[PDB]
Amino acid sequence: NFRGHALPGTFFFIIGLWWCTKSILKYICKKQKRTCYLGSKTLFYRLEILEGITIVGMALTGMAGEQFIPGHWNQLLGWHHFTMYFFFGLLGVADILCFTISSLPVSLTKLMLSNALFVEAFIFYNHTHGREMLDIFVHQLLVLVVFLTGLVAFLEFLVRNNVLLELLRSSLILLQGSWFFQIGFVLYPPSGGPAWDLMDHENILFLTICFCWHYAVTIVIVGMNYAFITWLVKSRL
Amino acid sequence: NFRGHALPGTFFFIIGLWWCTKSILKYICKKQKRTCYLGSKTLFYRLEILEGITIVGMALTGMAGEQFIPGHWNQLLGWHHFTMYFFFGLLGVADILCFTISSLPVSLTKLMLSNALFVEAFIFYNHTHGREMLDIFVHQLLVLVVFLTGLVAFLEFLVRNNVLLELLRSSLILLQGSWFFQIGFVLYPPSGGPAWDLMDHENILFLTICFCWHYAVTIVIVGMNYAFITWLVKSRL
Amino acid sequence: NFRGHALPGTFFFIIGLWWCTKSILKYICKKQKRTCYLGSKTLFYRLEILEGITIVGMALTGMAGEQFIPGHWNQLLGWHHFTMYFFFGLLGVADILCFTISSLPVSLTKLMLSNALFVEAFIFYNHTHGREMLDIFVHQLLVLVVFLTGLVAFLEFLVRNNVLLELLRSSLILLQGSWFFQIGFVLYPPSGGPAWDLMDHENILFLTICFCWHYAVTIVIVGMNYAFITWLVKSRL
Amino acid sequence: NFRGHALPGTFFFIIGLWWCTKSILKYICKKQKRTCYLGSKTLFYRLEILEGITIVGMALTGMAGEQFIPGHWNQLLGWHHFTMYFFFGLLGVADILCFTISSLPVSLTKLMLSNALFVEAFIFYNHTHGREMLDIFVHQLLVLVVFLTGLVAFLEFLVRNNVLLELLRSSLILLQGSWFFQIGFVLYPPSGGPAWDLMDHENILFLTICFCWHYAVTIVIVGMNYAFITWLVKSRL
């Protein structure tokens, strides 16, 4: 189960890094005088097509991996992950269609993303039924992060071309990935032996501070990525 | 009671399909060069008048059907449906008046719609008092859907001419209708014998996934309708 | 206590009627070709000054009436009404200052109004501590109405010159007044003898429908007032 | 602990006064005809640099003072204050960087501020675990104030150059400082002996009215500051 928690963390980390890099590069191209390094739009179209294809492929891979099998109910918990992966694949297909046919509005993709996020949150609001207070609290924090990311995505859809909103969305995605890794490390330690008790208000207090530190680290990572891309553009110019 | 649950499902399904078709046709007419096929505005006015008349008629029919009868309280539950139908009839009358007199703003109708939705949600927040956890959970999901549809309608009223928002509202209406049908099928099976226990967390988990699948199906239906209307316009041209 | 509940109902009813009439007259003046009947702005300034003076006077009168008296705590419940009246008086003073000095923005008054409403809601969220479920439910409905009115006022402040928003705010004020009268009639019947039991889910269900009917009646009253003002303008022209 | 509560109150009071003065001066400069008294922009740049430096210094001082020390958990409560001070220092550093490099958007600083506020609220939602109902209620009021201030800051970030929004944010900051002082005076009286019982609904009712009075006092202080700055500008001119 540790791998099952860790894989989405890597996926979200990669997606957030790619989106942040794309947004910074687009802003730099807008600031750019001409098509010397980034003005070409065919490169952007190819990057969008590749992004959609990779999202669809990752969704399919996650769906296949989660489903162990290639009038009753069994292993019902995996169907939630199945549905989440299906929604992300629908988002990828919608992005591919939008960037393939010019008639469809560009922002539609963003809308789809928001929808997917909301769906995920809804599922995570009911995925846990029993279990201990620590697990419940951690899953509620994950739900809060997903809901905030969905709200930010919807607001970005409403307001066209907001670089700060895109950076905030990327930071939230990175925070979600880091928190998924934290969930994995806490619930299923790789050391083999349990380390954190499931009933400790001290653990809850420490987890709150850890979540805040993760958010701060994601903000710092976004800033460092912006600085690195600026340095690379300056060196290229 | 199964018929009483099923009839609003059909009404909402028809209304959502009609609204989606109208929005797609309006967008196509805007993209159209001239009045060759859809540029005429008298057709739109006639369609709006017919839509208002049909909404008023359906509200009256539902009110009459719900009321079995043509200092105490009896059959108090039916008065809630009476009030909901009355509010929908008020929305229809307001739409007719707005499209009859040019002085009134067009968006007023939208506002009225939002109000009606909110009222419905409020009623459904108190309609159920006793009953089992499964029924309570299903009615709470219905309340959530109605509240989200009302918020989307209000936002559409605030922001003029958003095709994506109109499509989202139509998809939400279709989801509401499908969930009404699901409520009917679960609470009062047509088979005569009970099938689903009223106390099962497994049933709750399955219902969450069923709701997500219904939302996905509605999105797919909206996409297919858009494709079909595009095909029809291309064939006509 | 029945008079203490009824007086704010009359105040809110009068204020809502005056605001609705003012908004409709302003819209008609905007539609008007010239200063034949309503184009004069000195009339609007005089009306605003009179409105501010009347609001301040009503706030002072309510404060004086509520306070029976012209290291411990006694009659602490009246201080809440004192604070609400003080906030409304501050709103009136702010409106007078804004319409007296041209430097201050016009929308500031609206903002103040919103603030006052929010404060009222907050107080009504803690005014009731004990008491029965019926009283708690009715006060919670009043809190909901006040919160919705405050949100509508804030949104109107954000978006300049929205006639529909002003009409919605007026309808909400009228609904608040009617519900205050309902609270008075239910809690302290004028007949002398108690009529409604304080513990009845049937009473709760009836009160929900009564609230919906009050909202519908307020909407109808707003529509009738608009029609009457249109008739009067047409007759004058 | 009384000093630990009181110091942030003084910090917030000073920051709110400075921000209100800056906003009023900026509005007066905009109304000003030329650079006679305030048109110079180098003064604004120097003031912004000084504000950032002072914010960073105060954050560092608070962090050092809170940390008594220059596989277990001890004094975990202080890490929350450490994190809050770290976030405020990050806000100050971001403001300094934004006013140092022209490429970065100006509103970014505002965004950062909002983020910090939200983080603080989150921490204060979990800082208290045990304790009595009075302390819980007071901390919940503080959480509400912080959340409202964060929402106002985010809305100000969304809508450029709103003087009323800036004044509202300053008033909320002053209210937060005054309520911090109230918390200090109630929880840890300077008289040495306890005065307020920790379990009294009368105390809760009095605290609600005290909070409303604090809000009113902050509004009056903002108005007086505006009047004083107007008088000073008129005298200088």
UniProtKB/Swiss-Prot annotation, chains A, B, C, D:
It holds the Pfam family DUF716. Signal peptide: none annotated. It comes from the Eukaryota. The keyword Transmembrane applies. The keyword Transferase does not apply. It is a multi-pass membrane protein. It is found in: Membrane. The chain crosses the membrane at residues 5-25, 49-69, 86-106, 136-156, 204-224. GO terms for cellular component: membrane. Keywords: Membrane, Transmembrane, Transmembrane helix. InterPro entries: DUF716, TMEM45. Belongs to the TMEM45 family. This is Transmembrane protein 45A. It comes from Homo sapiens.
